Amino acid sequence: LEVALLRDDFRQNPTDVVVAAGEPAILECQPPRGHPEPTIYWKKDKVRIDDKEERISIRGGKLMISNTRKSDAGMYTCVGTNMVGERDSDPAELTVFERPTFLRRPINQVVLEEEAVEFRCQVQGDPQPTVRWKKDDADLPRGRYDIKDDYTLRIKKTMSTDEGTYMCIAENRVGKMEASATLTVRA
Ligand code: NA
Questions:
Q1: Residue spans per domain, the chain
Q2: Rounded to the nearest whole angstrom, what is the distance from the C-alpha of residue 66 to the centroid of ligand 1?
């Protein structure tokens, strides 16, 4: 003699998850109290899903998504079920971002004193990565460098002190990536 019952308040709602593509995502749910003890299943944008695919696993209170792809993003809902009815959790957004990569890596230059040189860096990612430039792991000297819109690093009248390793850094909220290239000067 226990009450046939289903509450409306989840013991644990799933919470939003932010991931870089390739990383795993884990959503957690505990259903409301009830009798009989509710089970759970999961919906993605109101459509019920299953653990058919190898990279998806549903067990306990967890939905586990290995090797996230941009497709995986959406609103995930946990549903608590028993013979009284179904209850929908507050939804959790899965965001899948893309760690920055290089469309165009900068390439070693070799140049004779007093004469133009340019270095190129084109990046991709989601969000769009912030591009930074360095020299010998320190800030670009003043006066010298001309800057196009695209992250092209330009010089009109090169000189010997300009010698060293020039690094392009691409950075968003989900990763960082470095690519450097030598500038060689000759009298
Ligand atoms: Na599976």
A1: 5-98, 99-185
A2: 10
Query: Regarding the domain delimited by 99-185, which CATH topology (the fold level of the hierarchy) does it fall under?
Result: Immunoglobulin-like (2.60.40)
Report how far ligand 1's centroid is from the alpha carbon of 64 (Å).
9
Asked if the peptide bond before residue 32 counts as cis, ω within 30 degrees of 0, the response is no
**Residue 31 near residue 8 (C-beta atoms within 8 A):** no
Residue 156 contacts residue 116 (beta carbons within 8 Å)? yes
CA of 8 to the centre of ligand 1 (A): 29
C-alpha dist (Å) from residue 179 to 85, 119, 125, 184: 57, 11, 15, 17
Q: How far is the CA of 5 from the centre of ligand 1 (A)?
A: 32
Which residues have a beta carbon within 5 Å of ligand 1, which is an ion?
A: 51, 56
Distance from the alpha carbon of residue 24 to the mean position of ligand 1, in angstroms:
13
Compute the distance from residue 27 Cα to the ligand 1 centre, in Å. Answer: 15
Peptide bond into 129 cis (omega under 30): no
Residue 156 has phi, psi (to 5 degrees) of -95, -40
- With breaks defined as C to next N over 2.5 Å, after which residues does the chain break? none
In this structure, which topology does domain 5-98 adopt according to CATH?
Immunoglobulin-like (2.60.40)
